[PDB]
Design a protein around this ligand. Structure first.
Ligand SMILES: Cc1ncc(Cn2c(C)c(CCOP(=O)(O)OP(=O)(O)O)sc2=O)c(N)n1
Ligand SMILES: Cc1ncc(Cn2c(C)c(CCOP(=O)(O)OP(=O)(O)O)sc2=O)c(N)n1
Ligand SMILES: Cc1ncc(Cn2c(C)c(CCOP(=O)(O)OP(=O)(O)O)sc2=O)c(N)n1
Ligand SMILES: [Ca+2]
Ligand SMILES: [Ca+2]
Ligand SMILES: [Ca+2]
Ligand SMILES: [Mg+2]
Ligand SMILES: [Mg+2]
Ligand SMILES: [Mg+2]
Ligand SMILES: [Mg+2]
Ligand SMILES: [Mg+2]
Ligand SMILES: [Mg+2]
Ligand SMILES: [Mg+2]
Lengths: 525, 525, 525
């Protein structure tokens, strides 16, 4: 067998059947004789390639495979990799390298010091020392991406390797099963369970690794047993809990003082599947108030190490959530009562308040819709206004890197063909990965894109106001016609200048057979 | 509180009470006002500092704290860090940096790009962005070193940071408890247990993380239940099993073909706490023979990812070994019978055969002796000839880096004051970290050093023979007087030119009140 | 031809004929069939290997070639590499890697992520992607080490590469000539010359790259023409000027305020071949006083970029010094008058003051002696008391990393067999690379080692006093018998407890046929 044949067999035996890519010369010897059982999903720029693959991996809860073009292709994707790192996305990023005979002279397309290029945004980065090593290196990449804490990995392959003879002993790679599905030993788990049972006023905080693990239902059971309020950890990349469940208390503010104030009076705070904590704004104060102790369950040693307070347990979130939910006592305390309905903001017949948009989406979207958020000034209102009953219903750029949601929404829709994906994206954010629209059109992936057009980088104007920072340049983005951009890439386009038009446009989009972009005229901050 | 006061409080609250170091200018502001409850152990060169700390950590099964002098001090220790990486040794390596005001100009003693210096031999490497961050960074270092898979970490601290005011919120760091004491979920563990119970001819292979976890006794129970032979994984850094137990089969040869041949006919091979596998010599063939399947339990994702065959489970070795030992059925098969006694090699009244030395050590040493090995051509015979009944009885440089055993033997003896440590070190190896002897003398740490003097780099002569490599320079090391070196550093010295003298010297050494070096004249290969 | 044959031919065609090494398994296929025209110099630990090679390179003014054993060997040398980086030493560091077939599994002796290991202390670091690339990679290493600014480089080679067929086109590598012997263009050089000619009170500061370039005599001519005082830049690794020439003003204090004060009243300060500046102690103030402007000529862009003041020119020091010396006008100003003789310190019949030792060395040593300094508390007095008329007469650890002088003195003596080398080394410093003594004995390299024994880390006690730092541990190093250590490694040993004995010992050492160590009892600080 050739290295080419052996590598594709390894991929298929490990459950990989799709290649997300943008091709180049160094990758042609890999992509040739492309297996008939594999799919290739082309995107027009590498931030888009990786964003699509990322959405696909996060929604499918399995690794996604990517193929990029040497250093420049890899480099174009590095902003996307920053998000993937923070979301623990299992991405296998491969890039083609020059033929071994031309690497020394640094021929055009040589990826110099290749393994260092994507650092520090990958768990493992490597270029094999010989062609016959390639299948083994691929095996390492697959497992490194897939083991807790999941994350992106990078493999660079000289293009002449693919046609070389494989080592017959590579067959031992094909069916390897590697598990990190582990939980705290019985003795210490019993101690934890007793602490939870004994708490007088427990609280629960959930992060994105809960949704990644599909631990949502177990966390619901845990919250109901403990009769505990449930918050989502700040800067949330995913939604880990049904947002209209009686215990739900919403998205935590991303500030030190704000969080300790919210947790005041709670004697035990159990954090599951989140960093402690992904703060953003400078909001100095106490990490916790006197009387509150914190216990974190995380899949990531780096998270456990850097928490400024609390105990921690490093384990698989699925295994831990299931064990805790099934072991804790049913508290005799009263179940928390549901948060009240959000207020209806006054809305005239002109430009749309974001609150109006979210209320309308919630009214019209199917109950199993999936939302993506890259409308950076409206996140708090989005979290209050969308009833998300099911797992896998929300994605937001985990490192705050714009250019995620547009392509990721296409990958999510590919992963979940029966769930309508609706990406709510600001006019500023829409540009970073605008060419991803083409992939939706070409493959007829029926994502709906809602562009919130207020003509400005609103979140930055807000932060500038907070800083009392005057005379900041570059905050306005006038003069973008999103319907024309959609037409440019072959996506049906609609405009909504008022509520009547928004309702009409959404009705049309929800009944469409392909992707649709709706440009919404929203109020200026 | 100052950063100095807060950091020492964090260290003591996290169980650290000893600093292994060689001091420099950038470290004086850390070392001043040294707490009266802490010990400082000086060594004269940094390979020695780190080797001592490494032995101490491995034997104590807890992190050891190191303080080195900027880049040059760190650099002098990097060979020692290579061993520590391979042995999963929990080492907190700190180094002083220039004052922040002088870093930009690159004043003398500036550690440039400090965090990159010890890579790739550390789990985490960092320099804090401000003085008030230092305690938090130290907390991260402690936990990163201590979490599975354990390993060395690096923290660089500008010397002006220590006198600055600490953040009062740093108190939340002091008592953090972080656990990685995890094992496979019940459902999948039951599957594993059933596979072991159903095996017709199981075999067990154990690596150093078993001894690190003190899982030895549980592995004995497991082997007795399964009625399975037990091998030690190749290139063994520690001894994970009693070497005269009936199931014990010794050290595996470090070759691909040799290992698959040894495992032939075993249907299930369970590897615990080892890489799969730390081969050395080129010995091509099948990774496993038809009919053999392999299951690896490892604490290290990097090990699980790179195994060329078998399934893997990434979990704590202590928790897994205990669970397996207590869950498996007692097989009705016959218990394996003990390996026969080693042959007595013919010995005249002249220079000592290594076999004679090991037999004599085994005869005379206490049953709870601890051995270290850096006699590179005699390892196989050492493993056959020493009855090591107890955990923590053997150490060998885990990355094959010479200069480990001499200082490590001092750290081990410090960790285990009631167990006689005997380091068996070749004449070549003895030189790498020779100045460590001084620390044994100064602190009266009563390690016994047995120098095997055959005048040559014997293992290299052997490998050259294997390669049929002629005209290799640099293989002979004549003209070293080890008694004089011992005298130079204040250690009692004895010579053994024959068996009578070896017995006399060992009797003297075993009754001595301080460290003793015995130079043994061994046969030339 | 084989890669082995082709690589040794490249080395010899590029002027390399000596390998400094400590061998290991991965290097045996390189070292076998060692060419009869090459020398191999063995040292017993890698800090010693690199120190010896460094002294050899610095004194010979040409690259030195080193061969180390995988990661652990490389790591043991990293403190030595820190000095080599700061001294711009052209060192070609090679290390053996595992066979390509065993790299993936990370067999024992695999150097993981090899090229990152010596960073940031090398100019270039690399592992070739195939065997046939090895000669080209070696060519790159040779030239990278040798081009201005000179420095260490690193090449990792899988051991199976050596026996493979070389590319016949590699012959084009053999005779490549690469020059960086460049100077400022005529127009701008004329501007510089006019500025120097027009200065009313110029001063000159010289650094180690002057001595490396053998630009010393040209700098003497320049100073005589400009009638300018000459200082040596702080933390001096080499001596760039005759120390009894009338213009000489000595070693600058390594402090910001001290230097600007010394330069006050000088309108133009010309710095040649030094960083601006290698300060050490914290001594805040003005970088330059009003009225002083600075112009730096440096071979190193990194130095030019980081200077906090002045203009800079990046060019070859030899070419620039020669051009300036020959272009400037002869000033009608009076030539500076020579510094007065140093005072004779009172000396009784007991332990030696360092001043006495240096005066005695100056009295007894040949006029072409070469000194090395690792007596850290006595540097200022050494610089005042040794008349060093010739180039290449002084070396001091350029990054302040101890363990340099003892091995470097052996390399310098090998480079300069007709010039008596005298290394003055503190009792503390002597231990870092003590085993280097063996190389001097084995190859009969007649270096004289003068150990200044005061029982303490004196420079650290001094700095602690400056910090008013109390209760610092680890500052005393009692109980070392240096005569016994010398005997241990086969070097003739003498002791000097008083001046009479010092004179007798020096007379004996200067007439000896081999290396000699003199242990001098010096006064305690
Ligand atoms: C790749 C990238 N570039 C720039 C930013 C900075 N940025 C920017 C430019 C924001 C404004 C986005 O504007 P929008 O139109 O998408 O949404 P809002 O008007 O609701 O803020 S929010 C923010 O953090 C970023 N996060 N990521
Ligand atoms: C730091 C370092 N340098 C060099 C080596 C190479 N090496 C060397 C030099 C060996 C010979 C050791 O000789 P010895 O006298 O200690 O023992 P034997 O004579 O029994 O081999 S074994 C080996 O791998 C190494 N492993 N580590
Ligand atoms: C590799 C390394 N380790 C530690 C130091 C710290 N250090 C040390 C330990 C000094 C004392 C040297 O003592 P000495 O006996 O050689 O000389 P003095 O007594 O004259 O200071 S000076 C100094 O910077 C260093 N520079 N380099
Ligand atoms: Ca906007
Ligand atoms: Ca030997
Ligand atoms: Ca001293
Ligand atoms: Mg258990
Ligand atoms: Mg699907
Ligand atoms: Mg490094
Ligand atoms: Mg379970
Ligand atoms: Mg103890
Ligand atoms: Mg010109
Ligand atoms: Mg010469």
């Amino acid at each position: 067998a050739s290295v080419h044949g052996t590598t594709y067999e390894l991929l298929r035996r490990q459950g990989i059947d799709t290649v997300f890519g943008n091709p180049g010369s160094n990758e042609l010897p890999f992509l040739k004789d492309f297996p008939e059982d594999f799919r290739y999903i082309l995107a027009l720029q590498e931030a888009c390639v990786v964003g699509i693959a990322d959405g696909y991996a996060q929604a499918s809860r399995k690794p996604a495979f990517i193929n990029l073009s040497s250093a420049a292709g890899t480099g174009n994707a590095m902003g996307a990799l920053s998000n993937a790192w923070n979301s623990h996305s299992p991405l296998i990023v491969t890039a083609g390298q020059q033929t071994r005979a031309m690497i020394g002279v640094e021929a055009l397309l040589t990826n110099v010091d290749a393994a260092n290029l994507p650092r520090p945004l990958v768990k493992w980065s490597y270029e094999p020392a010989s062609a016959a090593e390639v299948p083994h290196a691929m095996s390492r990449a697959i497992h490194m991406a897939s083991m807790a804490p999941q994350g992106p990995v990078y493999l660079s392959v000289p293009y002449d390797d693919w046609d070389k003879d494989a080592d017959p002993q590579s067959h031992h790679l094909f069916d390897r099963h590697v598990s990190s599905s582990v939980r705290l030993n019985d003795q210490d788990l019993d101690i934890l369970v007793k602490a939870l049972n004994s708490a007088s006023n427990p609280a629960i905080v959930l992060g994105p690794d809960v949704d990644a693990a599909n631990a949502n239902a177990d966390c619901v059971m845990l919250a109901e047993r403990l009769k505990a309020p449930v918050w989502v950890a700040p800067s949330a990349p995913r939604c880990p809990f049904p947002t209209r469940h009686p215990c739900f208390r919403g998205l935590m503010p991303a500030g030190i003082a704000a969080i300790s104030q919210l947790l005041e009076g709670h004697d035990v705070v159990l954090v599951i599947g989140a960093p402690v904590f992904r703060y953003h704004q400078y909001d100095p104060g106490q990490y916790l108030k006197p009387g509150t102790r914190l216990i974190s369950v995380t899949c990531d040693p780096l998270e456990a190490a850097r928490a400024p307070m609390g105990d921690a347990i490093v384990a698989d979130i699925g295994a831990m959530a299931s064990a805790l939910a099934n072991l804790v006592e049913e508290s005799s305390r009263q179940l928390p009562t549901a948060a009240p309905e959000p207020a209806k903001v006054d809305q005239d017949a002109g430009r749309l308040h974001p609150e109006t948009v979210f209320d309308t989406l919630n009214d019209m979207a199917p109950e199993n819709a999936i939302y993506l958020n890259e409308s950076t000034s409206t996140t708090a209102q989005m979290w209050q206004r969308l009833n998300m009953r099911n797992p896998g219903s929300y994605y937001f750029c985990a490192a705050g890197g714009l250019g995620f949601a547009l392509p990721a929404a296409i990958g999510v829709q590919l992963a979940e063909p029966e769930r309508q994906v609706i990406a709510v994206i600001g006019d500023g954010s829409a540009n970073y990965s605008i060419s991803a629209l083409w992939t939706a059109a070409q493959y007829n992936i029926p994502t709906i894109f809602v562009i919130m057009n207020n003509g400005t980088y609103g979140a930055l104007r807000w932060f500038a106001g907070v800083l009392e920072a005057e005379n900041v340049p570059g905050l306005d983005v006038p003069g973008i016609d999103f319907r024309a951009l959609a037409k440019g890439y072959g996506v049906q386009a609609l405009k909504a200048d008022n509520l009547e038009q928004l309702k009409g446009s959404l009705q049309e989009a929800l009944s469409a057979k392909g992707p649709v972009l709706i440009e919404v005229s929203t109020v200026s901050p």
